[PDB]
Amino acid sequence: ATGTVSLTDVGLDASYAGQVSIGTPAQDFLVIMDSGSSDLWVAGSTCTENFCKQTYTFDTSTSSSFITSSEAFNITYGSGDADGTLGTDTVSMAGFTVSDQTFGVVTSTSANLISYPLSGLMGLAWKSIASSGATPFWQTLAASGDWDSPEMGVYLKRYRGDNTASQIETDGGQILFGGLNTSLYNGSVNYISIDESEKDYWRIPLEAMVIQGNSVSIASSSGGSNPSCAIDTGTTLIGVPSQTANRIYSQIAGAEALSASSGYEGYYQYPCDTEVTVSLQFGGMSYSISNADMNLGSFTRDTSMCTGAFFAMDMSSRSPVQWIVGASFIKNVYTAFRYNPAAIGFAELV
Ligand SMILES: *[C@@H]1O[C@H](CO)[C@@H](O[C@@H]2O[C@H](CO)[C@@H](O)[C@H](O)[C@H]2NC(C)=O)[C@H](O)[C@H]1NC(C)=O
Ligand code: NA
Ligand code: NA
């Protein structure tokens, strides 16, 4: 079989979310679809955080199939963390069901992790990085032979650069579970193979980067000659090692690091009237990033300067990834996440 999740684009390409349903009878939630993590969680109805007061929450007491657990749930993202306890219940998405899906019932988070209309997050990466130890929903489906083809196809719609766009766009893209949507891409899919040691994040090697026509050195202390890049639908921008970010912005005349005084340490800005030409090389092909994705607008009162989508994020030397490649990149390609043989594919959008 196949099944489609319609995506809502929240926050001007900040987060892409789809509907999950949990419990009996079903309780429905809009959750971040996150190819950079592997746990499902939803804000619980007992949560006393302010955001929980203003969004839909999961009432464990009104699900007749809910199996409680005292086991703690704790997950950390680059943007913050979420805590609560594990639970088990029937979960559906895209017309599929997992009867005894383990997930987090969250009752605290770091400030501003999520808000209305979101209620949680569904991890689309591999079991080995699931904090809960549970097999991810998507992975159960793939492993069971339920899918026509063992892959997920992703389209993220772009609103950044549209001056009349809303903070909630329900026409936000699509995830196809169990195949690729041939109406949304053109030409052949270029698959980059992922070996058995790399089934954690969805990650692939960066071969090269070109900005303003200059090939940037992508060597790093953590990642050696070539970084391993999380292809991460759950992040907004492109996070890279500090050294690499410095090198990137050195290729744009007039670029400078934003001071920590601004409140934007790790970000860089450059002249707003410079259209930046930039591509990332994966699997022997260059993939362009449109100027509408690259230019985030002015972050300070100096309106002649605009912030770029690449930012400095030094990561744990315990991380297997040195780049986090978010929606800023992904909006420019149709993306296939292939379970078997394990691979990430890219195609030109139609
Ligand atoms: C592939 O993507 C296309 C384009 O988004 C989907 O087409 C829509 O499907 C719905 C109902 O299934 C129609 O009512 C819409 O009018 C279609 N939109 C357009 C622009 O044609 C299509 O459903 C997707 N296919 C799969 C299998 O997910
Ligand atoms: Na993530
Ligand atoms: Na420099």
Side-chain angles (χ1 to χ4, degrees), residues 1-242 244-349:
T2 73
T4 300
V5 173
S6 189
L7 299 179
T8 300
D9 178 340
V10 178
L12 205 68
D13 305 351
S15 293
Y16 291 85
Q19 175 181 292
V20 71
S21 55
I22 308 172
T24 310
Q27 294 176 52
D28 284 19
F29 308 96
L30 200 60
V31 297
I32 297 171
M33 300 299 288
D34 181 17
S35 71
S37 70
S38 302
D39 295 282
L40 173 64
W41 61 266
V42 64
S45 66
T46 62
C47 175
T48 61
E49 303 279 29
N50 292 130
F51 84 91
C52 298
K53 311 301 198 168
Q54 292 150 44
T55 198
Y56 299 99
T57 56
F58 180 60
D59 187 346
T60 62
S61 308
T62 59
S63 175
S64 64
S65 43
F66 186 76
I67 303 166
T68 190
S69 150
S70 53
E71 199 60 47
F73 174 74
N74 180 11
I75 183 72
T76 302
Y77 303 108
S79 49
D81 49 28
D83 294 288
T85 64
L86 295 178
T88 303
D89 211 332
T90 183
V91 175
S92 305
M93 174 180 265
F96 293 97
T97 301
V98 179
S99 285
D100 287 290
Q101 180 67 56
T102 293
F103 63 96
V105 184
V106 163
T107 58
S108 57
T109 75
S110 54
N112 310 118
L113 187 66
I114 60 157
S115 44
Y116 179 86
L118 306 176
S119 299
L121 180 149
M122 181 183 270
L124 290 173
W126 298 86
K127 183 186 185 173
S128 63
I129 60 162
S131 186
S132 65
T135 310
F137 184 88
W138 78 276
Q139 195 175 336
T140 297
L141 297 182
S144 293
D146 295 334
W147 286 353
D148 283 2
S149 179
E151 63 184 336
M152 306 186 273
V154 178
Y155 170 50
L156 307 181
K157 196 156 211 308
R158 178 191 293 109
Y159 289 88
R160 195 188 307 288
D162 173 6
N163 52 8
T164 64
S166 169
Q167 294 291 124
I168 301 173
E169 297 278 1
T170 60
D171 188 14
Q174 177 191 113
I175 299 181
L176 181 58
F177 286 168
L180 306 185
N181 192 327
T182 60
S183 305
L184 302 180
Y185 75 89
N186 186 219
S188 66
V189 180
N190 177 30
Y191 287 100
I192 296 96
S193 293
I194 286 161
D195 73 37
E196 299 183 10
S197 79
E198 291 165 324
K199 292 173 178 176
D200 41 67
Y201 295 94
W202 285 106
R203 66 189 169 94
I204 52 168
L206 183 62
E207 298 172 339
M209 170 177 192
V210 185
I211 178 151
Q212 302 294 74
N214 291 336
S215 189
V216 178
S217 167
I218 58 171
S220 61
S221 311
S222 41
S225 309
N226 300 73
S228 185
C229 304
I231 307 304
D232 189 349
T233 62
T235 62
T236 309
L237 305 181
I238 305 167
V240 310
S242 283
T244 302
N246 289 344
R247 285 182 169 101
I248 292 168
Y249 287 104
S250 296
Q251 308 306 323
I252 299 164
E256 60 185 6
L258 281 157
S259 74
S261 310
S262 60
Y264 299 114
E265 192 181 348
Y267 301 85
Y268 297 74
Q269 61 180 4
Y270 62 88
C272 289
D273 68 345
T274 297
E275 170 183 84
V276 176
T277 304
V278 47
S279 65
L280 303 181
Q281 192 181 307
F282 291 115
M285 302 190 50
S286 294
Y287 294 101
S288 296
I289 297 174
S290 75
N291 197 62
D293 301 320
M294 177 65 184
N295 190 323
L296 307 184
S298 300
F299 281 24
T300 75
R301 287 145 282 156
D302 183 354
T303 201
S304 65
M305 296 295 271
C306 277
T307 300
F310 294 89
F311 72 104
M313 180 172 69
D314 288 312
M315 15 223 333
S316 177
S317 53
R318 311 183 191 290
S319 181
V321 288
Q322 299 77 43
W323 285 37
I324 305 302
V325 172
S328 294
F329 171 75
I330 298 168
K331 281 180 278 158
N332 301 271
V333 287
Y334 191 78
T335 305
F337 296 96
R338 185 165 73 192
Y339 174 76
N340 184 30
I344 293 169
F346 299 124
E348 183 194 13
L349 287 164

